[PDB]
Amino acid sequence: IAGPLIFVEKTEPVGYNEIVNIKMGDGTVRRGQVLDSSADIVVVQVFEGTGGDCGVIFTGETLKLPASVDLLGRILSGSGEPRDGGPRIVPDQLLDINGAAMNPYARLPPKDFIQTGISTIDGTNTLVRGQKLPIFSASGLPANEIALQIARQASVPGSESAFAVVFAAMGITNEEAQYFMSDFEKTGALERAVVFLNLADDPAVERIVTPRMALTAAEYLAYEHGMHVLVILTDITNYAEALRQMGAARNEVPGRRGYPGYMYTDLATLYERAGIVKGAKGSVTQIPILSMPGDDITHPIPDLSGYITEGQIVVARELHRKGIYPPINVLPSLSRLMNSGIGAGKTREDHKAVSDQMYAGYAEGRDLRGLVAIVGKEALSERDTKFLEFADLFEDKFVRQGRNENRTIEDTLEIGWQILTHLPENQLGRIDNKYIQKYHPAHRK
Amino acid sequence: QIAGPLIFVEKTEPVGYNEIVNIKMGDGTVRRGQVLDSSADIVVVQVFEGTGGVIFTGETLKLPASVDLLGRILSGSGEPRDGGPRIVPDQLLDINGAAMNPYARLPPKDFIQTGISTIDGTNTLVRGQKLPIFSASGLPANEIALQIARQASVPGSESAFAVVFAAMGITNEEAQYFMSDFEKTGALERAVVFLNLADDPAVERIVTPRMALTAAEYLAYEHGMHVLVILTDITNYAEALRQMGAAPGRRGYPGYMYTDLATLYERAGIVKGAKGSVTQIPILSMPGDDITHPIPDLSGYITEGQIVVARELHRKGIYPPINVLPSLSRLMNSGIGAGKTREDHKAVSDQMYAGYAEGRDLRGLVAIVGKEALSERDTKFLEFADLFEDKFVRQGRNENRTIEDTLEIGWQILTHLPENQLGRIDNKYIQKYHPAHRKAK
Numbered sequence: 057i058a059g060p061l062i063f064v065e066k067t068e069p070v071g072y073n074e075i076v077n078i079k080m081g082d083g084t085v086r087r088g089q090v091l092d093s094s095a096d097i098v099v100v101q102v103f104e105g106t107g108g109d110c111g112v113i114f115t116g117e118t119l120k121l122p123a124s125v126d127l128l129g130r131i132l133s134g135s136g137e138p139r140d141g142g143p144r145i146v147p148d149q150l151l152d153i154n155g156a157a158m159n160p161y162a163r164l165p166p167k168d169f170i171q172t173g174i175s176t177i178d179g180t181n182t183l184v185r186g187q188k189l190p191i192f193s194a195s196g197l198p199a200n201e202i203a204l205q206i207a208r209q210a211s212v213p214g215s216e217s218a219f220a221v222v223f224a225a226m227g228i229t230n231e232e233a234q235y236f237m238s239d240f241e242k243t244g245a246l247e248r249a250v251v252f253l254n255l256a257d258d259p260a261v262e263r264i265v266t267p268r269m270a271l272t273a274a275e276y277l278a279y280e281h282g283m284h285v286l287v288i289l290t291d292i293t294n295y296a297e298a299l300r301q302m303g304a305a306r307n308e309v310p311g312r313r314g315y316p317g318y319m320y321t322d323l324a325t326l327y328e329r330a331g332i333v334k335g336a337k338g339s340v341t342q343i344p345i346l347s348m349p350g351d352d353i354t355h356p357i358p359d360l361s362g363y364i365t366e367g368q369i370v371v372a373r374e375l376h377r378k379g380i381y382p383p384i385n386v387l388p389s390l391s392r393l394m395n396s397g398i399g400a401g402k403t404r405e406d407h408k409a410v411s412d413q414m415y416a417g418y419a420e421g422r423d424l425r426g427l428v429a430i431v432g433k434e435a436l437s438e439r440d441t442k443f444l445e446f447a448d449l450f451e452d453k454f455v456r457q458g459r460n461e462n463r464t465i466e467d468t469l470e471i472g473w474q475i476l477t478h479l480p481e482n483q484l485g486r487i488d489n490k491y492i493q494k495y496h497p498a499h500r501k
Numbered sequence: 502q503i504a505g506p507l508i509f510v511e512k513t514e515p516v517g518y519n520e521i522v523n524i525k526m527g528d529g530t531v532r533r534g535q536v537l538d539s540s541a542d543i544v545v546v547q548v549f550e551g552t553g554g555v556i557f558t559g560e561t562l563k564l565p566a567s568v569d570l571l572g573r574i575l576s577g578s579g580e581p582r583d584g585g586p587r588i589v590p591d592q593l594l595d596i597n598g599a600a601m602n603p604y605a606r607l608p609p610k611d612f613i614q615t616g617i618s619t620i621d622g623t624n625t626l627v628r629g630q631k632l633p634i635f636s637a638s639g640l641p642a643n644e645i646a647l648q649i650a651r652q653a654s655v656p657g658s659e660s661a662f663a664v665v666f667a668a669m670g671i672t673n674e675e676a677q678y679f680m681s682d683f684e685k686t687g688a689l690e691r692a693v694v695f696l697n698l699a700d701d702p703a704v705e706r707i708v709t710p711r712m713a714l715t716a717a718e719y720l721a722y723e724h725g726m727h728v729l730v731i732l733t734d735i736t737n738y739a740e741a742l743r744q745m746g747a748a749p750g751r752r753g754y755p756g757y758m759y760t761d762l763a764t765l766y767e768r769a770g771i772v773k774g775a776k777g778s779v780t781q782i783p784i785l786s787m788p789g790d791d792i793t794h795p796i797p798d799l800s801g802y803i804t805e806g807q808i809v810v811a812r813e814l815h816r817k818g819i820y821p822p823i824n825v826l827p828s829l830s831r832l833m834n835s836g837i838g839a840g841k842t843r844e845d846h847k848a849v850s851d852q853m854y855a856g857y858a859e860g861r862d863l864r865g866l867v868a869i870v871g872k873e874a875l876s877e878r879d880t881k882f883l884e885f886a887d888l889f890e891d892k893f894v895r896q897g898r899n900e901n902r903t904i905e906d907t908l909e910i911g912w913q914i915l916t917h918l919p920e921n922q923l924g925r926i927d928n929k930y931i932q933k934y935h936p937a938h939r940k941a942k
């Protein structure tokens with residue numbers, strides 16, 4: 057009665073709303089209606105149970121991920137076909153992609169540390185295994201540089217489980233695709249990744265399948281192979297631009313009669329797919345890139361805010377215009393699950409205190425940039441001038457890091473302590489005295 | 502070619518573009534700067550580095566400050582818009598923020614009841630906080646801002662409460678509607694309302710929030726009030742900065758904008774003496790067409806949380822369409838609990854948020870496996886997300902819910918979940934407040 061969308065291998069032309077029978081990955085059958093198609097893929101909306109044309113009807117099989125540990129090291133299209141000049145994947149298992157396969161997720165909360173090597177993530181809004189932590193951006197800002205840098209650098213310090221990356225790019229140019237391929241190959245980051253690249257001019261249905269192939273590969277490696285898998289998806293806004301024109305959505309208006317029910321829940325079929333996996337040896341973590349579209353009036357898309365429930369990393373033009381990379385502004389950024397990923401045994405015991413203190417000092421110094429403008433630099437107190445200066449040091453030393461610079465959390469906390477020495481010790485009101493004596497550079501060892 | 506911070510000066514003598522001038526500061530020192538632009542009555546000066554100081558020496562632009570600002574509707578330059586007399590000042594206060602430092606070195610802290618459950622309940626506004634409403638084109642952020650202006654209060658505070666409502670670049674039809682709403686409801690009697698119209702001079706648009714914040718400072722510090730300042734909309738303020746001294750040069754916003762915004766968002770907090778406070782709720786609207794209105798980086802204003810106005814809920818016909826999941830108030834814990842709201846508040850908030858996030862993920866699961874494949878337990882959480890949106894998020898335009906009202910709606914919809922699944926609620930609160938256990942007193 058208009059349920060789930062599934063994705064089917066196309067073997068003949070089909071018409072809109074054509075009734076079809078589909079053999080699922082688990083061997084059962086479904087009846088449904090065609091919504092749209094590319095050369096090789098059909099999007100079908102399933103009926104529950106029996107019926108919801110009826111004699112001489114198309115029978116098809118679902119589109120599958122060829123799942124194997126040998127996905128690692130390969131660069132594929134959005135449909136899973138090679139782009140790297142290698143042979144097609146030889147599967148251990150053929151899995152449906154819409155999220156129904158495996159039932160992999162545990163009812164356990166996300167928890168341990170993922171070291172991205174980027175101080176403004178690991179330091180102040182830590183990524184934890186099983187989390188969904190979007191990077192929020194806008195045209196012109198280097199969100200894909202950050203995504204690619206995390207793909208090269210990320211690890212799970214101390215874990216007994218192997219680590220893998222799934223990197224899925226949607227709607228990208230040829231030059232972007234060549235650049236991402238080059239990057240993965242030259243750095244050796246490819247050996248632990250599966251890369252799915254969908255181009256702007258590839259079929260829109262292929263773009264819609266892209267994150268499902270990627271999430272299914274991640275779930276397979278996490279659950280069947282006990283891995284912590286980090287899924288980078290770029291750009292969910294480009295996905296949404298294909299979705300709003302696919303199938304039953306075409307020239308229909310959100311909020312109006314004729315807009316199809318599945319458009320309100322499609323994005324949740326992506327964001328639901330993250331978490332610790334059963335057995336607790338592996339996990340699926342997502343870092344989706346959400347770029348602010350500049351065209352809400354002309355191209356209404358489903359609301360992206362459903363993707364934002366466990367925090368956000370905010371890319372700020374102010375910092376970009378100052379010449380700083382990564383231009384992440386930690387103050388509007390948040391990781392709701394950070395405390396589950398930090399402290400003794402995970403990062404270091406002083407982690408929360410240092411993050412809290414850097415955060416508070418930076419927010420105060422940024423407000424003092426306003427006060428300086430209101431009263432003049434020479435009217436600021438000594439103490440306030442220290443905080444004003446601290447916000448510069450924060451931006452120039454802690455936020456700023458090289459594209460190729462992979463900071464351990466120790467590196468990150470040490471830079472944090474060094475800049476914190478600019479503040480008067482009696483002004484560190486978020487840091488327990490135990491930690492000042494043990495870790496502050498004036499008391500250390 | 503526009504470098505330093507903007508200071509506003511009373512036009513007392515004719516000035517020229519780029520003229521070098523001194524500005525007299527509230528303590529008798531002077532700063533030096535250069536004329537950037539001017540209207541007939543207000544000069545915009547860019548100040549130089551300098552410090553304390555024959556050429557023009559200008560006076561800062563002043564707010565005519567009196568408790569009799571309350572009940573008045575004024576332009577962005579403070580002139581009457583309500584057919585009343587010009588304000589008779591007890592004090593003339595520099596609007597640039599420099600003659601009086603009312604702020605204490607104290608964190609924001611007690612409760613402001615907006616009467617809107619999706620703020621009070623889950624993302625509480627506290628006194629001294631800056632809590633932006635993040636909106637986008639075609640969403641009802643100004644309805645929400647007006648409803649907060651009508652409803653907000655500080656329950657049990659010994660300090661009286663006031664509102665300052667400042668609207669920038671608005672239409673005549675919007676201005677009439679806001680004036681009508683404040684008049685008819687009586688919300689005007691405790692408010693100072695500053696209305697800048699789209700076609701008023703752009704210089705008055707950038708003075709508008711400075712007039713507003715100076716009025717709030719004056720009431721809060723010199724009259725011991727909690728003042729709530731609602732500023733709508735910082736994107737239109739940014740658009741006016743794209744003007745100052747140009748007829749304009751290229752696409753983006755001026756580089757000094759980020760420091761200029763800080764002169765607005767620094768002006769919030771508890772005031773010295775701790776019997777008053779300035780709280781801000783700025784509306785930050787993303788433009789609907791970035792070709793003609795590029796997207797500004799207003800993230801400098803987002804350091805203590807934000808309230809997210811969401812298209813999904815608006816498309817589903819729910820007012821207020823606030824999505825609690827991406828919303829946050831970083832200072833909420835300072836505003837809630839025994840003696841402020843009610844002891845169970847944090848628990849009920851944590852439980853509703855966890856139950857709604859779970860229910861919303863389960864809408865994704867239904868769209869994968871079909872509704873009939875969901876477990877009976879999962880179905881309760883699915884249904885909970887519907888109850889949360891239809892009973893808790895949804896409320897009338899004029900429905901003013903006490904925090905008690907909000908927490909009781911919360912308990913009623915929480916009864917739909919299995920009691921054993923309430924992992925965020927202390928067994929003591931379940932025994933005392935859960936409708937299945939609570940005793941009639």
Ligand SMILES: NCCc1ccc(S(=O)(=O)F)cc1
Pocket residue numbers: 512514515516517518538539540541542
């Ligand atoms: N028209 C904007 C520039 C400008 C510059 C100077 C003045 S005046 O107040 O000195 F007559 C007025 C306007």
Ligand SMILES: [Cl-]
Pocket residue numbers: 373374753754796797798
């Ligand atoms: Cl900007």
Ligand SMILES: [Cl-]
Pocket residue numbers: 310319320357358359812813816
């Ligand atoms: Cl939507």
